[PDB]
């Protein structure tokens, strides 16, 4: 890394205002229908969101006891933005090591904890449940069949991207990116705080973004300096953030922090979701960092729409019979 992170945290130059500050009672499906979820949103307060979080003093070791000491986890080497892997017990030990004793900066942003004890301790905002393609489009009996709590692709019965635990030590940086498949992101600061930089996905900015990835000077160019308008903004403890599809963002951690969030495709900015997928195609992103079963899910979205409106099914007889059985529960 060849740019000075501390000036990027100190400058006033990132003074765009893209974020709408909202009350939770107003974040509903009518709002989504009306606005296309195009705008980043901040809920300073969790009222009317329908969220559920763990005990306020929950710790990384608590997380590890719910997901298992031996669960393998993706960790990010901050310095290089490369990925490594260790067990949650090892991660927990790193995280409990004193600041001055930790040789390297490591971040976890990719612990998906569905089908573990932790999963029922966390609930997203309700409105997400009304629009997430996983819930509303994927054949239910497949989703329900999932037993594996890791992200082993071979055991995966649906796109396992709904509930993530992110655990970050003071000093963590995640460089500019767009979430996989153009997914939208909900993001809840349980303990600590985060600083975000936000760039809107105008055609131009997405062009710069892709060019920047293909150039590999990502440690050299702070992408926010390359664009007309960038907003830097702090999330405090108990805030909830929603990031629309395509939004290019980086994130710094000023204090040890615990965050629960997750990713979701929806029916209201499909064009963007496809744009982002195609950028991953072109820049050759490994499958593992992508949204599982992307096109498969898109096929099921089409089938649902035609079925819910016209009442003609394009599912197999067996799949139709599995859905009837669940309708009768």
């Amino acid at each position: 890394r060849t740019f000075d992170l501390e000036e990027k945290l100190q400058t006033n130059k990132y003074n765009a205002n893209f974020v709408t500050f909202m009350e939770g009672k107003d974040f509903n499906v009518e709002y989504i229908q009306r606005g296309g979820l195009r705008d980043p949103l901040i809920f300073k307060n969790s009222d009317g969101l329908g969220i559920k979080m763990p005990d306020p003093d929950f710790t990384v070791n608590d997380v590890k006891m719910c997901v298992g000491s031996r669960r393998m986890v993706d960790v990010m080497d901050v310095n290089t933005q490369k990925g490594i892997e260790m067990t949650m017990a090892q991660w927990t030990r790193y995280y409990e090591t004193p600041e001055e004793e930790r040789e390297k900066l490591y971040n976890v942003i990719s612990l998906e904890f569905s089908h573990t004890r932790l999963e029922n301790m966390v609930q997203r905002p309700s409105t997400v449940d009304f629009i997430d393609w996983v819930d509303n489009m994927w054949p239910r009996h497949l989703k329900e069949s999932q037993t594996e709590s890791t992200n082993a692709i071979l055991e995966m019965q649906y796109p396992k991207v709904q509930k993530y635990c992110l655990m970050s030590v003071r000093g963590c940086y995640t460089d500019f990116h767009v979430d996989f498949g153009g997914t939208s992101v909900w993001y809840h600061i349980h303990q600590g705080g985060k600083v975000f930089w936000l760039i809107p996905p105008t055609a131009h900015n997405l062009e710069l973004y892709e060019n920047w990835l293909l150039s590999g000077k990502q440690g050299d160019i702070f992408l926010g300096d390359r664009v007309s308008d960038c907003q830097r903004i702090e999330l405090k403890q108990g805030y909830t953030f929603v990031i629309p599809s395509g939004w290019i963002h980086a994130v710094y951690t000023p204090t040890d922090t615990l965050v629960f969030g997750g990713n979701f495709l929806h029916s209201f900015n499909i064009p963007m979701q496809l744009k982002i997928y195609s950028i991953e195609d072109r820049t050759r992103v490994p499958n593992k960092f992508r949204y599982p079963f992307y096109y498969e899910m898109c096929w099921y979205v089409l089938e649902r729409y035609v079925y819910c409106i016209t009442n003609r099914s394009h599912l197999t007889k067996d799949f139709q019979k599995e859905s009837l059985s669940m309708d009768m529960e």
């Binding site: 993706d74 890791t150 992200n151 500019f176 820049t283 599982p292």
Partner: peptide
């Protein structure tokens, strides 16, 4: 060695 999917991470440097 099981292959994974849905790993959140930006590109490397």
């Amino acid at each position: 060695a099981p292959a994974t999917g849905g790993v959140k991470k930006p590109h490397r440097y």
